[PDB]
Amino acid sequence: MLEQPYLDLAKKVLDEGHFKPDRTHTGTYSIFGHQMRFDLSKGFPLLTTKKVPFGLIKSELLWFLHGDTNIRFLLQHRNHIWDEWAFEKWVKSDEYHGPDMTDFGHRSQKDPEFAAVYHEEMAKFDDRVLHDDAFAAKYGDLGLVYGSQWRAWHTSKGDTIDQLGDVIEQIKTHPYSRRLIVSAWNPEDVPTMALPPCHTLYQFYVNDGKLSLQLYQRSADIFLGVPFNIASYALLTHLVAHECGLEVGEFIHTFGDAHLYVNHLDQIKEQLSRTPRPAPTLQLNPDKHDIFDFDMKDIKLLNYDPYPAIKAPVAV
Amino acid sequence: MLEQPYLDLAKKVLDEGHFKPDRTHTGTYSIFGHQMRFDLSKGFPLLTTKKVPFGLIKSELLWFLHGDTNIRFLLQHRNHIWDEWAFEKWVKSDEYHGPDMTDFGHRSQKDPEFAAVYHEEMAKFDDRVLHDDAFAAKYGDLGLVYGSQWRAWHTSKGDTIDQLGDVIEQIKTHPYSRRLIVSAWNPEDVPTMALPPCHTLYQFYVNDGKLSLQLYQRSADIFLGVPFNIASYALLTHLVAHECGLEVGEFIHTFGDAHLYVNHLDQIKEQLSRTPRPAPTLQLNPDKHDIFDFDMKDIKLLNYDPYPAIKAPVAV
Ligand SMILES: O=c1ccn([C@@H]2C[C@H](O)[C@@H](COP(=O)(O)O)O2)c(=O)[nH]1
Numbered sequence: 001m002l003e004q005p006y007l008d009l010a011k012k013v014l015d016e017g018h019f020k021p022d023r024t025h026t027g028t029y030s031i032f033g034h035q036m037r038f039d040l041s042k043g044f045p046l047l048t049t050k051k052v053p054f055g056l057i058k059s060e061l062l063w064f065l066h067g068d069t070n071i072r073f074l075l076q077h078r079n080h081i082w083d084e085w086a087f088e089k090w091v092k093s094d095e096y097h098g099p100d101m102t103d104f105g106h107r108s109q110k111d112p113e114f115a116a117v118y119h120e121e122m123a124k125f126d127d128r129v130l131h132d133d134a135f136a137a138k139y140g141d142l143g144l145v146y147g148s149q150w151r152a153w154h155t156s157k158g159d160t161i162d163q164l165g166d167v168i169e170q171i172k173t174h175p176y177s178r179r180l181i182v183s184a185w186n187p188e189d190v191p192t193m194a195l196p197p198c199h200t201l202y203q204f205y206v207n208d209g210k211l212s213l214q215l216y217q218r219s220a221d222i223f224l225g226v227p228f229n230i231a232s233y234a235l236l237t238h239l240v241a242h243e244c245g246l247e248v249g250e251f252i253h254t255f256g257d258a259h260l261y262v263n264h265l266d267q268i269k270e271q272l273s274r275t276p277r278p279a280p281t282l283q284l285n286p287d288k289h290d291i292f293d294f295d296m297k298d299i300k301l302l303n304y305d306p307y308p309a310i311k312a313p314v315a316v
Numbered sequence: 317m318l319e320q321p322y323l324d325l326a327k328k329v330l331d332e333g334h335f336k337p338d339r340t341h342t343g344t345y346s347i348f349g350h351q352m353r354f355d356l357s358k359g360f361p362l363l364t365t366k367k368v369p370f371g372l373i374k375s376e377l378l379w380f381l382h383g384d385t386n387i388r389f390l391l392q393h394r395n396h397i398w399d400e401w402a403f404e405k406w407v408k409s410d411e412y413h414g415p416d417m418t419d420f421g422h423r424s425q426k427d428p429e430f431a432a433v434y435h436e437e438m439a440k441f442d443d444r445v446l447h448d449d450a451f452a453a454k455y456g457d458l459g460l461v462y463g464s465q466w467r468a469w470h471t472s473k474g475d476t477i478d479q480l481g482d483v484i485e486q487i488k489t490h491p492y493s494r495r496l497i498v499s500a501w502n503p504e505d506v507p508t509m510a511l512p513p514c515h516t517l518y519q520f521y522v523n524d525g526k527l528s529l530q531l532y533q534r535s536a537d538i539f540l541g542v543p544f545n546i547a548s549y550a551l552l553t554h555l556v557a558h559e560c561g562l563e564v565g566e567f568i569h570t571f572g573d574a575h576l577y578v579n580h581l582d583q584i585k586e587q588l589s590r591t592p593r594p595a596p597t598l599q600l601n602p603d604k605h606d607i608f609d610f611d612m613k614d615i616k617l618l619n620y621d622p623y624p625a626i627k628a629p630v631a632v
């Protein structure tokens with residue numbers, strides 16, 4: 001059944017995982033070095049044992065393919081995955097005349113009244129990124145985020161490199177290259193980044209007419225994050241393959257520190273008693289070929305029948 | 317037996333490998349996505365089924381740990397692995413008043429008299445890098461090579477970052493980081509590099525007092541190159557662990573395109589009939605703790621009993 005590598009990765013951390021402290025005041029069960037492999041010709045590896053919001057994945061990947069780093073687009077697409085990073089920047093600066101708000105995400109966990117104070121402050125900031133252009137330009141732009149690492153890597157000489165654009169031209173003219181790599185890790189910037197990229201690097205490969213992609217993810221949250229992560233990069237492999245007139249082959253997910261937070265152990269156990277169902281089919285618009293101009297309506301997910309969502313706390 | 321992941325990787329390419337053309341006018345059997353794992357507490361994974369020159373590995377790693385990019389040090393250590401890249405630069409420029417020499421490495425394969433002409437031209441250039449300081453400074457310095465990617469990553473602001481130095485300080489103060497990464501891939505430079513780094517990135521991990529390291533190697537020559545590659549990074553894991561007062565745990569080798577050249581198939585088959593022998597022991601100098609000042613005499617390889625070397629052509 002296609003999602004079995006995930007169930008086996010999760011069962012495996014459950015049984016071999018060494019406890020490890022981490023960042024958040026919440027510990028983890030961790031393993032280092034793991035690789036799973038998904039044959040994208042048998043289906044689209046969106047999980048059927050819990051509901052994953054495919055709309056969120058889809059608009060986030062498009063924001064990256066457009067080389068965009070401003071939250072105004074995700075918000076227009078009802079997507080709020082990157083909000084708090086933008087919000088954090090608002091609250092550490094000069095027009096933020098407002099309530100106590102530092103340590104806010106953790107505080108919301110065991111929040112006083114504070115949770116609706118944070119959540120209406122947040123709804124303020126967001127409405128404003130949507131409607132005040134100059135605000136959006138200043139507190140809505142996250143800067144160094146996947147869209148710019150992938151499509152506007154800044155050089156020493158003050159210019160910008162479109163890593164991804166170029167690798168697509170390389171797949172087109174030189175399919176057999178072993179240099180079809182894109183990277184989000186920049187030595188210069190990760191010293192003072194909020195979150196250095198978890199999806200550090202990925203490599204493309206063409207053989208027998210099929211395109212495959214291998215991702216190196218330095219760090220992964222098995223429960224909350226990996227279901228999204230598998231789906232963003234399986235989507236990218238379909239998208240780049242379409243654009244190059246290639247067939248899809250495998251997605252290979254390689255892990256550095258794969259971890260399960262200590263407050264997610266019941267929910268993963270919960271999920272591990274579900275039987276997988278047949279995999280959804282991805283359908284891509286036949287008329288459009290430039291993936292940089294794909295649009296939500298051009299990506300169709302067919303026949304997805306998940307088990308109910310499982311809710312779990314974001315550990316901080 | 318410790319080297320079994322290699323024998324199984326080679327047997328596996330032999331049986332699943334899809335033929336693929338490549339760069340050199342010599343084809344390959346290739347696989348994409350592979351990970352093997354070596355428990356460095358059971359021995360040092362230098363191969364016993366063929367003789368690997370451990371002195372060469374050892375001086376090459378030291379040249380990188382010194383952040384050096386000039387061939388004068390390797391030559392002083394009788395090591396010539398990087399010669400041709402330096403030589404290639406000599407021959408494409410102005411003082412090279414000498415014979416026909418372009419396409420030289422391939423031509424040597426089916427060389428006329430040319431092989432001793434190349435090999436004495438080469439012995440000229442090398443004696444000169446050794447003795448003429450200004451020559452060494454100009455045609456002996458390769459530039460962008462592991463020593464500088466690791467220890468003097470050039471920033472936009474014209475300065476230099478010692479990625480490796482810093483990750484060792486991070487292992488010392490924050491062992492549980494998931495950001496202990498070093499990278500040799502630079503978007504800016506790989507457009508016009510001779511050879512973009514094969515060993516693209518590696519990640520460190522500390523748990524239960526042991527240090528582990530995972531390497532992402534985009535491209536590998538199973539026969540000639542991977543025996544060296546396993547040994548350079550198993551050496552680095554011992555060396556950084558010593559320097560941090562840590563015990564050694566695993567080396568995990570992740571592959572992008574793993575390939576076997578078509579003119580190495582008898583020799584790998586040849587090797588696959590040898591039985592492995594017990595693994596050598598690495599012994600490191602107890603008095604020295606700063607690995608940046610390690611020296612050949614401080615690294616001891618104990619009890620290595622290889623099978624004879626197997627000679628095979630460098631494919632070009
Ligand atoms: O699958 C994913 C990928 C990323 N993150 C990350 C990585 C860690 O789980 C967390 C904190 O970042 P680091 O400490 O790992 O750098 O955010 C997830 O939550 N899930």
Ligand SMILES: O=c1ccn([C@@H]2C[C@H](O)[C@@H](COP(=O)(O)O)O2)c(=O)[nH]1
Pocket residue numbers: 178179339511512514535536537538540541542545
């Ligand atoms: O194990 C190793 C590592 C590197 N190289 C490389 C990579 C390819 O085998 C060859 C050419 O470089 P690329 O075309 O792969 O970039 O030199 C090897 O020969 N063996």
